Amino acid sequence: HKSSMVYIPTTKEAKRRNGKSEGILNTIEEVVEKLYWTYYIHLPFYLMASFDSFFLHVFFLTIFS
Amino acid sequence: PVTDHRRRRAAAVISHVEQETFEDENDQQMLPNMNATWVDQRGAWLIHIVVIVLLRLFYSLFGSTPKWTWTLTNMTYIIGFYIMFHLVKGTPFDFNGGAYDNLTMWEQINDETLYTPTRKFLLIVPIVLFLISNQYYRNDMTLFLSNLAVTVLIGVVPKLGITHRLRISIPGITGRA
Amino acid sequence: YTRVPLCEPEELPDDIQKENEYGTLDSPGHLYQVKSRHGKPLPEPVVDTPPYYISLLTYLNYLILIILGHVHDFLGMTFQKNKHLDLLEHDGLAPWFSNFESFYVRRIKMRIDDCFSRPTTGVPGRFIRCIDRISHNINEYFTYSGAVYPCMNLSSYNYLGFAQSKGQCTDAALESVDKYSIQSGGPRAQIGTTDLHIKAEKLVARFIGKEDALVFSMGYGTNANLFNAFLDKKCLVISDELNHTSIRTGVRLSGAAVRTFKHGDMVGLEKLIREQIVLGQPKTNRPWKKILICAEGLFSMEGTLCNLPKLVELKKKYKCYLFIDEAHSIGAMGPTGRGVCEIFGVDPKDVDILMGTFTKSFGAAGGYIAADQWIIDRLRLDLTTVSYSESMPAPVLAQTISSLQTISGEICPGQGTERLQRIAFNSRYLRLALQRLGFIVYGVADSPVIPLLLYCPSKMPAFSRMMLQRRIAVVVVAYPATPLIESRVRFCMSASLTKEDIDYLLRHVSEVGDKLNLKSNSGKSSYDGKRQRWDIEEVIRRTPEDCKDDKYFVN
Amino acid sequence: PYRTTVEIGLILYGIIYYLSKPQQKKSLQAQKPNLSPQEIDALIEDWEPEPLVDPSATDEQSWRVAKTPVTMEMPIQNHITITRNNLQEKYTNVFNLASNNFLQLSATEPVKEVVKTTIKNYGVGACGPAGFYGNQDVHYTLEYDLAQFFGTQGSVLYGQDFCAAPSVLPAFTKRGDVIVADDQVSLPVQNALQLSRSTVYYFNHNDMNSLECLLNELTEQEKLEKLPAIPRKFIVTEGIFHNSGDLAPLPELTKLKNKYKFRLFVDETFSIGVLGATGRGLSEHFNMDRATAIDITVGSMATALGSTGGFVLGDSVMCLHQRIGSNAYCFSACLPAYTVTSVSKVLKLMDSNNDAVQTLQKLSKSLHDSFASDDSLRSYVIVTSSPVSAVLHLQLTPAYRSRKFGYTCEQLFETMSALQKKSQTNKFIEPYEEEEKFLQSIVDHALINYNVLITRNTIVLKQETLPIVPSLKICCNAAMSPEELKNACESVKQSILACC
Ligand SMILES: C[C@@H]1CC[C@@]2(OC1)O[C@H]1C[C@H]3[C@@H]4CC=C5C[C@@H](OCCC(CO[C@H]6O[C@H](CO)[C@@H](O[C@H]7O[C@H](CO)[C@@H](O)[C@H](O)[C@H]7O)[C@H](O)[C@H]6O)CO[C@H]6O[C@H](CO)[C@@H](O[C@H]7O[C@H](CO)[C@@H](O)[C@H](O)[C@H]7O)[C@H](O)[C@H]6O)CC[C@]5(C)[C@H]4CC[C@]3(C)[C@H]1[C@@H]2C
């Protein structure tokens, strides 16, 4: 039984295994960026998004001082 | 007219909103309001404290004197609450035909029940905030008077048994019923 | 490029087309039989909640969005008027709509409008073909190219897999077209009625179990034009808060007084009835003429079953009347497919008025109302749709008759039971696997609708978009349709899907949820009261065997 | 001292507010003071409700069901075989004059082939709502074809025609608006007006002076009121009336709406496909442009186009608003595909050639001239239909009705209004039933003696709000021959004379 359907390979399973074998030193940064982006309201914005990311980076630098 | 569905704009210094008729009241308010229902939910009472703490931290990051931080956070919180709750009159989406065109969110909370626990909490919060904050500007009398006036005339007077469905025509001839 | 192209159908062999439309069973061990609860009442369901910081973040995001939207609206419509010419008065004419009444659609929903209203083509079977498009500006307009790709179907109202192009139903429809043309003379009172309508009415009445029934072309109009026939200003209507819009429109057109009770609260209902019977009519304090209670069989948003025995006991004790909607329950629930009356064991003679719709499960368009003899006799003369609207065409009648005969078992033996067992097994397996992975799932143990909770707003678009890159179609709903905290994604299962497709879906959903941090389970979902964070391989290896046991489901 | 006292004052009031009344409720329209629990059960046990539906008058009003004709295993066409009274009586080869289909272009071979191909390649069921994977890229083509054919900017489809007007009008009106409507609108328009929740006025049937005076008075009052904003205003009418059959003076309405800044809503259920040189609608009849003449247009695809559904025409902004603000559009399933393809093919065919419209107009004019200039029926019946209409309506003279049944339209209207206002359970009127029985007797006599089937206006008097009287209807279509129609006219005239 064959149907005209194309299956997309799953990442981390025959995607990062056969084609290439590099998956280290970048998982932590990817996780941090994904958490920061998904837990803040950014997608429904347009260019007030830039202004808010600058705001948060400035809070960070000043408070760290 | 065979229906006589008109909105009146009677002019007087002090006025009240008329009681709704049988068709308007008993029949057009049956489904959830979806505007004041979110008040009594999970985590809907700690958000005020979280907002106050965040505002205090943000105003402290500038590096001002202790008095001005507290004065600024008090005024900004009270002004924001008044703007969000007591200013707009209506609903952001059609309900049935415009049945809630004359009531603010504070008057729509808990289906017009005067004394509910959430109203008690929302009235108690400003008093505690003022009592905590006034310890840092006791010496200066002008700041004390300004903060007291802002707390009483804006954060307490609109939340009263009287001044419910009360309208004043000084800023504009309002539409009652 | 701007207009949607007309796609020429592909040329494929018959067997490949059949495989595309309907799946093929692999092993006989993937079938489950549904039992009937004779004397067991429904316990109150338990819900699960995430930690507080999710709710706090949601509140902060909504506050920021509202403030920014209002500021932008004010500044833009104050400092420039040439661009906003559709919201301002012009030469003494008011605009079509208002600023404040359409704020949420203009400022919140227009940013992710590509997640709604996706054009498709072909039959909506197991695999659905979707047309490619490119968004311009911010979801303002779209550019279309000549490319279509298949995707797994999880967003269509196909419960028993009757949306097929090759089978007995299609042949019956073609023969009906050959015999009866597509023309309808007019209203059923003037010339419109034929013998096929009588046959369909008798078949529906025999299938449901009541004494008489009537059929209509549109399901929405059935509720829209029903309550004004036997209700007036001196009657009371008590209905649940989670009801469809058609019932509300019908009640509003009727003009009777309306009172509502909280979802799944029998004590509140009893108190309300006891108060209203004594209070009487307004301004005169005379007794009410009659009391009607409206309820739904299964709620599509949450998949919760109404408590029928308690309602029957209350209506017997207080002498009220009962109206039941069965849009999502007919032909898909119960040991045979009769509806909730078969699940609970309640005799169908106790319910006063029953409704149903043929769109969800029978692959047609129409609706039906079932009642006793004299009630139908009076309603036929007193109804408005009968003598003022059109009539349902022949091909839809033929399709519905063929579907009903197939489910009953008169023709093509051994097919209805197979489909019912497949859909039950698929629903139970998916629900158990999703609950074991660590997600949050609502509904009863065997419900075709599975809602998955996505509390944060920004997690709603991205998720869907990711599923578009992996050839899976989903549907998401949020405020104001649902409560502010609860934004969810709805899975609609079909009897055509195969277990391997379910495994593929499970792997992809597990990885996406792991990336997006969607696993938030408090341990109340498990039957042994512990947190469950299982591996995907172990879940796939162990869930199918344990899916049959009913001790692993809390509700 | 002074500072301490102020702090105590705020604290003391907080305790009083916390210990307030036990959740004081809202003053509703009904209330009863407290009474002893023990006597409550007596009130509960003494309650006696009414039956769900009244069965008292079912037997006397049940003759309407037994007289409904049923077609037997053949499509509805000019010649049919029918059975009545549960197969107790059967008639074969009966000429028909009660079919709403006029052009009869949906029974041709190309439309059948297109329908078969669409069914084979698409299925029968849409299986989805409007916004959830519902559009099957043929709805867009149909919308574009309708917009291009009728000379507008856009159109919106609807599953059923009876639920189109009550779904679009409430979306654009609310409390505080003004609606001026004619006193002869149909039942769906009345339902839409009732659900609109806005002020409604009525003016005389086709009288420009009354409309002008009403508009002038309303404009003067609105100008005197000095409102902060301009409310929405509308004018409600229709092209050809379903209960009467007259025509609307479009140029005068256009001039008035341009002068007094109003908007026009028009129902074109019975005018599209029958009026104009080609069949564009009412605008082509008066040689005008639909873009500026009419603001909202509602039409039905079942009367002449040949398939179920309806549509609403207009500009881009209105359609965009209707995409989300219409209850029927959002909360209903999509229309099937074969109907859409058949309607598109019919539109293409009608654009290609225009002979059916000419034949239909000739037949309608001949029928009206045949039933208009007969002197033997002057004392009994009257004609209330325009010559351009494709349906002929016949009514009884008031003198004859007063002589036989002894009642008048105003008395019936006021009696029905009083009964509706008092909300009576039983609503039965004798002279109305007698007149309906007389008309049914005429129809049965004609059918039995001459094998010709004609229809009678089927209305429900309970649901009506405006005055109306029973009448007879005769329909026509482009597929008939002049000789048969000429013979049938004389047959019906002979039957009418014989019955009276
Ligand atoms: C320290 C710094 C200093 C600086 C700063 O930051 C802080 O200071 C700050 C001070 C800020 C404002 C503070 C507070 C508000 C009000 C708020 O809430 C109203 C929101 C909307 C909803 O509510 C109203 O509207 C509903 C719908 O109509 C009413 O419904 C019914 O009302 C009646 C029944 O009850 C019946 O009539 C009917 O049934 C029905 O109408 C409802 O009653 C009524 O309440 C309204 O919004 C619109 O209001 C105007 C009308 O649409 C728009 O204007 C336009 O309108 C005309 C166009 O030709 C021209 O006349 C104007 O010139 C032209 O501009 C305006 O642009 C737009 O916002 C909207 C935001 C705003 C303005 C803030 C903006 C940002 C600042 C300027 C900051 C600023 C940056």
Ligand SMILES: CCCCCCCCCCCCCCCCCCCCCCCCCCC(=O)N[C@@H](CO)[C@H](O)[C@H](O)CCCCCCCCCCCCCC
């Ligand atoms: C970007 C930067 C901003 C960052 C944040 C600024 C912080 C300001 C601090 C003020 C704090 C006051 C509020 C604290 C109490 C509320 C805390 C929880 C809020 C959760 C909100 C949940 C969603 C509610 C939706 C319900 C709803 O739709 N209600 C409608 C009623 O009809 C109205 O939509 C609504 O209510 C009023 C809308 C009109 C007022 C909005 C403000 C207008 C512009 C503001 C700019 C003012 C001038 C410049 C500062």
Ligand SMILES: *Cc1c(COP(=O)(O)O)cnc(C)c1O
């Ligand atoms: C889905 C739904 C409908 C849809 O009716 P259609 O005529 O098939 O579009 C009707 N009623 C209910 C309760 C529904 O949930």
